[PDB]
Design a protein around this ligand. Structure first.
Ligand SMILES: Nc1ncnc2c1ncn2[C@@H]1O[C@H](COP(=O)(O)OP(=O)(O)NP(=O)(O)O)[C@@H](O)[C@H]1O
Ligand SMILES: Nc1ncnc2c1ncn2[C@@H]1O[C@H](COP(=O)(O)OP(=O)(O)NP(=O)(O)O)[C@@H](O)[C@H]1O
Ligand SMILES: Nc1ncnc2c1ncn2[C@@H]1O[C@H](COP(=O)(O)OP(=O)(O)NP(=O)(O)O)[C@@H](O)[C@H]1O
Ligand SMILES: Nc1ncnc2c1ncn2[C@@H]1O[C@H](COP(=O)(O)OP(=O)(O)NP(=O)(O)O)[C@@H](O)[C@H]1O
Ligand SMILES: Nc1ncnc2c1ncn2[C@@H]1O[C@H](COP(=O)(O)OP(=O)(O)NP(=O)(O)O)[C@@H](O)[C@H]1O
Ligand SMILES: Nc1ncnc2c1ncn2[C@@H]1O[C@H](COP(=O)(O)OP(=O)(O)NP(=O)(O)O)[C@@H](O)[C@H]1O
Ligand SMILES: [Cl-]
Ligand SMILES: [Cl-]
Ligand SMILES: [Cl-]
Ligand SMILES: [Cl-]
Ligand SMILES: [Cl-]
Ligand SMILES: [Cl-]
Ligand SMILES: [Mg+2]
Ligand SMILES: [Mg+2]
Ligand SMILES: [Mg+2]
Ligand SMILES: [Mg+2]
Ligand SMILES: [Mg+2]
Ligand SMILES: [Mg+2]
Lengths: 224, 222, 221, 224, 222, 221
C-alpha cells in the first residue's frame, strides 16, 4: 500500500516493516541525548553510501562543522560526502513564517537531487522565536511542502518527559504521518535506551518499545 | 415515538458493544491519542455503509489530503477511489493551503444533499469557545439529520476525554480509543463511555488493527 | 426537630439519604460525563409527578426539550404526555444554533404557573461562579423550590466540580462516579453532605437500567 | 504558659490539652461537609450552656435562619439563646477591606458581652469578592483586632484536598496562632472523619489525626 | 585565612549535626511548613547565645507582636522579658499595623549596633523579585557581620525548600524542618541540607519539641 | 577520530567521561541546591592550574570572590595565592547590595589576558533563556574556551534545569543529584550526554570530602 525506503539503521527496517514511508515525513522525538541527531545523520549517510541517494541535512542550533566533527565518532567522513556533492548541510542557525526556510530547503533538494532530508531540530526555532502560537500551522506548512516536493524526511523534535507528551508543544505528532519516539529511561540508577514506532499512517509496523544501544557503529536496535 | 434507533457500523465487534450500532441522526465523538485508529474508524464507518447498505457517505478532512486518505485506505484493500467515482463517497477537502465554521457547515450540508449521504465522518484556544463552537456543529448536524462520526485529539491515555476538557459534555455519544503502554508493549482498547438515551456495554474492549481494519474482541481478551 | 425531606423514589436513594432530599433546598449532583446526572434529575421530577402528583420544572441548558423527551423513552417514560397534561414544564435555556437574574425570574414564573414543587436544573473564573451560583441557590430557596442541580467534573476522585466552589455554596451534595479500574467501569453514588441532617456515608454502587437508577448495598459487586 | 478555654466538645479538650487558647483565634479548616460549621456552633453553644459565656456567630453564606434550623438536628435551641440575649448571629451575607465588618463584630461583642466568637467562613467573602490578592493582609487585620478585643475565636476556612494545603489561599495557617484540620478521607469507598491540631503557638497539644463521628449529640472525637 | 568557623547554638543535638554550630557571620535559612518549630528554633538560638555565652541578640518579628513572642516563650520556662530589660535581647517590631526593605535593614543594623548584638533572628510575588530582595538582605547582613537565622515558609513536607523556589539558592546555609504525617501520626525531623564551605551531617534527624525546647535525636530514632 | 577531552582530575570523573570534558565546548552541570555544582566548577579550574598549569577564569553571579575563596579553604585550597600568581581570575558579576553580550566581552577579555584554557560560569521566559544561553555557548565555542556552566533545578528526578531548555543547547550535560530516601541523602553524578563521544551511563554515587568530589563505582553503597 505505501512504499518504504530502507534506513539500513540496524534493526529499524525490521521494526518499521521495510523502512520509512517514501515521500513523507517521520517525526523522531525524544529527550536530550536520546540519539535523535544520530538517527537523522545515519538516515542520510546510509542513503548515500548504500544507495547513492543524496541527502540534505538542515541544522538549526548545531553548526555544520560540529555535525561533521561529531560524526567522526562513528568513523563516518561527512566532509568527503559534502566534497563529492552527495550531502548538503544547510545551516539554519541563528510574524513567524517558515516560508523563506522552505525555499532554501527546496533549492538544496533540487540542486543536489536529494531523495532524503533530515531536519534537526525545528523545535529550537519555534522556541527561540517564541512561536508556540503557530507551531501547528508552520509544521503543517513544512510537512506539506516537503510532501509536494517528494522528499522522504526525518524531522526531529524535543520532549521533556520519557513518558509524557510526544513532543514539546503537544501538537507535532498530529500533523506528522509517521512518529518514532526515542526514550532514555532512568530506573534504579541505570539508563536504558528504547525506540518505539508509535504510528505510520496507512501501513503496518511493530508495536511497543524496542531496546537499542549507541556504539561506534551508530544505532543498534534489537527487534525482539 | 420510541427510543433512539441505531445504524449498524459492521465494524467487527462494535455493534455488539453499542447494542446495535450508532444512534441515528446524532454525532458520536471518537477521541484518541495519535495513532489510536480514529481516522480508520471514521473511514470504516463510511465504507461499510456504502458496501453493506448502499448508504452514501461524506468524509470531511481537515489536514490529510483526499489523495492521502485514498492512499492510506489501500492498506486495508479498500478502493475509495472507486466509491468516489461512483458518487457513493465524497471527500470534502477542508484541509489548509500549504477558520469559518458556519461556512464549513454549509459545505457539509451541500455535500450531504448532493450525494444523498446518510453517513458523515469529520476528522478531526479557550475551552469556552471550543464548547460553544462544537455545540453549534453538533446541533446543526442533528438538524440536517446526518449520522456522524467526529474524531478528536487527546494527550493522555487515562486523562481527559479530549484536548479541551469540554468536548464529551456537548456530545450525545462518546467513544474513547486508547493505545496503552505497559511493560514496553502496547494494547489497543475501545470504550463506549456514553450513549444518551440508550444502552451499551461498559469498560474497555481490546482491539487490533489489521489488513481487515478494526476488529474488537471480548472483555479481558488478549 | 429534623429537616423535612421529600422522597425521590429513586431505588435505594431514599435509604442512603435517610428520607430523601431536604425540602426547600438545592442538591448538587456532580459527575463526569455519562455518569447519570440528567437521568437522576429527570427521575426526581418524573417520580414526583407519577408518585405524588407534584409538578416539576426541568431547566435545560444544552440538550433540547425534544432530545430530553426522546432520551427518556429509553426508560419507558412518556414525558411528552406529562408536558401536555401540565404536570411537567421543560424550560428551554439551550442556545439557538444559527443574564442570571433574568433566568431566575423565568424559573420563578414557571414554578408559580405550574405550581411546581420540584425543580431540576441541568446543567470562567471561580469568583464569579461562586457569586452567581450563590445568587441562584439563594433565590431558589426564597422561592421555596426543592431543586436538583447538576454540575460537571473531570476526574473521578478529584475536585467535586469544575470551579472548586460549587459544593461549598450547596446545602446538599451528591457525587456520581464512573470508576475505571482493570478495564471495567463501576458506577457509584455518594452523598457527601446534607446540611442539618443525617445520611449514609461513602460510595454505594449503582446501575442504570431500563427502569432508571438502582442503587445497591455497601461494598456490593 | 497560655490559658485555655474549655470547648466541651467531646474529646477535643483532651486533644488540645485543655481547650482553645484564650484571647486568640483558632483556624478550623476542611473540605466541604467536614463539620466546620458544627464545630463552630458547638463552641458557642457549649460556652453559653455550660459557662454562661455569651457568643457571637458571624455567618457569611448561610442565613441565620438556616443556622438555627440546622442546629435543631442536634436538639439545640439557638432561637431561645438569641431570645435570651446570650447568642448573637451576625449576618454578613451578600479595594477589599474588612474594616467595616470588624466594626460590626466589635459592636456585637461589646453589646452582648461575648467571650466566644465563631466566624464561618471568611474564605467565602474573599472568594466572592475576588480578593485573593489581599487575603494575608485582611485575615491578619481580622485576627489582630479580635486579639486586641480579647475574643476567643473559631475561624473556619475551606480547603479542597484532604492531604494538601491547609487552606484555599495557602497563607491562612501562617497568620493564625492555632490550626485545626478536619478531614473526611475517602478510601476503599468508605469515608472516615478525623481531626488534627496541627499547631498551637506557645503551648502543647496531642499530635496527628484523631478519629471522630458526628451524631445527634454533635462532634465526638476519640482521643486515642 | 582558615575555613569558616561556627558559633554553638546549644540546641540539643544541633551542634553535632552541624559539626560545630552555625557558620559565623552568615545567615542560615530555616524553612518549614506551619507549626514545624521555626520561631522556636530562632528564639532558642538567641536565648542560648545570651544565657550560655553572654552574646546579645536581636529578634526581628514580622507578624507576631513582641508581647506574644514573650508570652509564647514562657512555654519553655524562658523569661525573655528579663533579657529585654537587661538589654541583652531586643525585639525589633516590624509587624504590620492592625514594604521597605532598605529601611528595615537600617533598623536592624541600628539595633545590632545599639545592643552589641552577635546573633540575629529574622522571623520570617514574582520569584525573580524575591530572589533579588533576599539576596540584598543576606548580603547586607553579612556586611554588618551578624550571624543570622532567617525563617521561611513552605507548603509541602517533601516539595520545594521554600515558598518561591529561589530562597535556598541565595542562602549560604539551609536547614529544613519537617512535620511528616504518616499513618495518622506526625514525626518531626530536621535536616541540614547545605552549609557552604564546611561539613555537616546529612539526612533527616528526628526531633521533639518539649518544655525544654527543641531536642534532636540520632538517625532513624523514634 | 574522536573528540579531544581535557582531564578534570576530579576523582572518578575522567573514567565516567571516558577521558574528561570535550575540549572547546561547554558542559552543563545542573543540580538542586547544595549538590556540589560550585565545587565541581572550582575543582575543574583548580586542578587545571595545579596539575597542568592551565589558567582558569571563574565567573561568579551571586557569591562574592572573597566568599568563593573562603569556602574553598574547606578543601585546603589556597585560591587567593592562585589569583595573586595570575593563574586564576575571578570575574565578579555578582550584584552590588546598596546585558549578555557585554558580559561575554569581559569574559573574552579575561580569557585572552590570562591565557585561560578553562572557564567556569556559576551560575524568566524559556524562549529568551534559550536564545541567550545559545548565544553564550556559541560565543564561548568561537573563543575556544572549555567551559563548565552550572545551572539550577528544583526536583531530583524532574527537568534537567529550571527552564526546560538548558540541556538542549548544551553539547555536554552532567546532572548532580542529592536523593532523599528513608531519611538518608545519597549524592549521585550522571553524565546524561556528550555530543560526538562516549561516556558511562546512569547514576554514580559520590561523596564530598576535605579533598573535594570523589565519584564511586556502579551501584555502590
Ligand atoms: N562512539 C560512541 N559510542 C557510544 N555512544 C556514543 C558514541 N558517540 C556518541 N555516543 C552517544 O550518543 C549521544 C549523542 O546522541 P545525539 O544523537 O547527539 O543525541 P540528541 O538526542 O540529538 N541530543 P540533543 O540534540 O541534545 O537533544 C551521546 O550523548 C553519547 O551518549
Ligand atoms: N494494514 C495494516 N495492518 C496493521 N496496522 C495497520 C495497517 N494499516 C494501518 N495500520 C495501523 O493503523 C495506524 C493508523 O491509524 P489511523 O487511523 O491513521 O490513526 P489516527 O488515530 O487517525 N492517527 P492521528 O491522525 O495522528 O490522530 C497506524 O499507526 C498503524 O499502526
Ligand atoms: N435503557 C438503558 N439501559 C441502560 N443504560 C442506559 C439506558 N438508557 C440510558 N442508559 C445509560 O445512561 C447514560 C446516560 O446518562 P445521562 O443521565 O445522560 O448522563 P449524564 O451524566 O447527564 N451525561 P452528560 O450530560 O452527557 O455528561 C448512557 O450513557 C447509558 O450508559
Ligand atoms: N444528626 C446528625 N447525625 C449525624 N450526622 C449529622 C447530623 N446532622 C448533621 N450531620 C452531618 O453533619 C454534616 C454537616 O456538617 P457541617 O458542619 O455543615 O459541615 P461544613 O464543613 O460546615 N460543610 P460546608 O460549609 O459545606 O463546607 C452533614 O453533611 C452530615 O453528614
Ligand atoms: N511546652 C511545649 N511542649 C510541647 N510542644 C510545645 C510546647 N510549646 C510549644 N509547643 C509546640 O511548638 C509548636 C509551635 O512552634 P513554633 O515555633 O511557633 O512553629 P512555627 O514553625 O514558627 N509556626 P508558624 O509560625 O505558623 O510557621 C506548637 O505548634 C506546639 O506543637
Ligand atoms: N570539607 C568538607 N567536607 C565535606 N563536605 C563538605 C566540605 N566542604 C563543603 N562540603 C559540602 O559541600 C556543600 C557545598 O557544595 P557547593 O558546591 O557549594 O554546592 P552548590 O550546588 O554550588 N550549592 P548552591 O550554589 O548553594 O546551590 C556543603 O553543603 C557541604 O555539604
Ligand atoms: Cl547506549
Ligand atoms: Cl494492533
Ligand atoms: Cl450500569
Ligand atoms: Cl460521622
Ligand atoms: Cl514533638
Ligand atoms: Cl557527601
Ligand atoms: Mg541533537
Ligand atoms: Mg487520523
Ligand atoms: Mg446530561
Ligand atoms: Mg459550613
Ligand atoms: Mg512561627
Ligand atoms: Mg553554588
Amino acid at each position: 500500500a505505501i512504499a518504504k525506503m530502507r534506513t539500513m539503521i540496524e534493526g529499524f527496517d525490521d521494526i518499521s516493516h521495510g523502512g520509512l514511508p517514501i515521500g513523507r515525513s517521520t517525526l523522531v522525538s525524544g529527550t536530550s541525548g536520546t540519539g535523535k541527531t544520530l538517527f537523522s545523520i545515519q538516515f542520510l549517510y546510509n542513503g548515500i553510501i548504500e544507495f547513492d541517494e543524496p541527502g540534505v541535512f538542515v541544522t538549526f542550533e548545531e553548526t555544520p562543522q560540529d555535525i561533521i566533527k561529531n560524526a567522526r565518532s562513528f568513523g563516518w567522513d561527512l566532509a568527503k560526502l559534502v566534497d563529492e556533492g552527495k550531502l548538503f548541510i544547510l545551516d539554519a542557525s541563528p510574524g513567524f513564517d517558515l516560508s523563506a526556510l522552505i525555499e532554501r530547503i527546496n533549492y538544496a533538494i533540487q540542486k543536489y537531487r536529494a531523495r532524503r532530508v533530515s531536519i534537526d531540530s525545528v523545535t529550537s526555532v519555534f522556541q527561540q522565536y517564541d512561536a508556540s502560537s503557530v507551531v501547528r500551522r508552520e509544521l503543517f506548512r513544512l510537512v506539506a511542502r516537503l510532501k509536494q516536493i517528494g522528499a522522504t524526511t526525518v524531522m526531529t523534535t524535543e520532549r521533556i518527559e520519557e513518558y509524557g507528551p510526544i513532543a514539546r508543544y503537544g501538537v507535532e505528532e498530529f500533523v506528522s504521518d509517521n512518529v518514532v519516539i526515542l526514550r532514555n529511561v532512568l530506573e534504579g540508577e541505570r539508563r536504558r535506551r528504547t525506540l518505539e514506532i508509535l504510528k505510520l499512517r496507512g501501513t503496518s509496523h511493530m508495536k511497543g518499545e524496542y531496546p537499542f544501544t549507541i556504539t561506534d557503529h551508530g544505532i543498534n536496535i534489537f527487534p525482539l
